[PDB]
Amino acid sequence: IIGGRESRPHSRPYMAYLQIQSPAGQSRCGGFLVREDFVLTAAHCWGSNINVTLGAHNIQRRENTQQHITARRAIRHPQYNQRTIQNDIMLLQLSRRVRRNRNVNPVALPRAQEGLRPGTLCTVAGWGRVSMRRGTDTLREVQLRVQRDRQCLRIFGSYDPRRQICVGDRRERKAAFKGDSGGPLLCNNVAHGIVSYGKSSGVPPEVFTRVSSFLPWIRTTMRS
Ligand SMILES: *P(=O)(O)[C@H](Cc1ccccc1)NC(=O)[C@@H]1CCCN1C(=O)[C@@H](NC(=O)CCC(=O)O)C(C)C
């Protein structure tokens, strides 16, 4: 997270930290709990072995609020396109349900087909880098403004307004960045987006997967 602030500890109980493949550091992403046994994240964060940490603030410390659970299945959307980074969404079915408590609980999802007005203020959180030079050990967050699709439509070749959201005012140095992929974009306390990609500079606007477009697939995968 660039341009944000450290989150009040344990105030976003749905946040998940993903350790992808061995050794401990092969790759990292964020995610968010959507049910006691399921975490939503970005498909590009896929790995053969994924260790999910819930209840954390400082991911470099053994905190007593932390629950570490391995992902039993990592279900990438069927049409995920690694080249264009399209349909960048994945469900992680946990090997055991989390023990639900104040520090560990699911976030609300939007209703299907629910859109979002440009200009809307949303919050994104994560353990990603804060600059090209440094990272963070603790959770941070920042408020970003929803942009007109039109703007991303002209900046990123493979942008699809029906499945993605254009996010962040170029005028502010605020953005999700490396390591924040898979994290949620919370708009009025509902998880509307998933951090997907942007410019290597970290300069906004950037692209988030639009969760409300995948509700039927989400619901099918968790039910079935
Ligand atoms: P996530 O893995 O932590 C990451 C998050 C991010 C957000 C905004 C800016 C930079 C990073 N996502 C990625 O690294 C994704 C997934 C692999 C490719 N990708 C990138 O976003 C890349 N950018 C693009 O392909 C667009 C480049 C452009 O139009 O300039 C690179 C690797 C940053």
Backbone dihedral region for residue 202 (phi beyond 0: left; psi -120 to 50: alpha; all else: beta): left
Query: Which residues constitute the domain of residue 158?
Result: 1-12+107-212
Is residue 24 a contact partner of residue 56, using CB atoms and an 8 Å limit?
Answer: no
d(CA 181, CA 28) in angstroms, rounded, equals 9
Residues 72 and 1 placed together within one structural domain of the fold: no
> Is the bond preceding 23 in cis, omega lying within 30 degrees of 0?
yes
Are residues 120 and 17 part of one domain?
Answer: no
Q: Identify whether residues 93 and 181 lie together within a single domain.
A: no
Residues 102 and 136 in one domain: no
Q: Are residues 92 and 143 in the same domain?
A: no
The 184-187 sheet, strands edge to edge: 5-6, 140-145, 121-126, 184-187, 190-197, 206-210, 164-167
Q: How far apart are the first and last CA of the chain?
A: 35
**Residues that are catalytic:** 44, 88, 181
| C-alpha dist (Å) from residue 181 to 27, 94, 101, 169, 177 | 11, 19, 25, 19, 7
Question: How many domains are contained in the chain?
Answer: 2
Domain co-membership, 73 together with 26: yes
CATH code (residue 205): 2.40.10.10
Q: Determination technique for this PDB entry?
A: X-ray
Domain shared by 71 and 7, yes or no:
no
Resolution to 1 decimal place, in Å = 1.8
**CA nearest to 31, candidates 214, 191, 198:** 191
Nearest protein CA to atom 18 of ligand 1, as residue:
197
Q: Which atom of ligand 1 is nearest to the CA of 178?
A: 3
The residue among 150, 130, 126 whose CA lies nearest residue 29 is 126
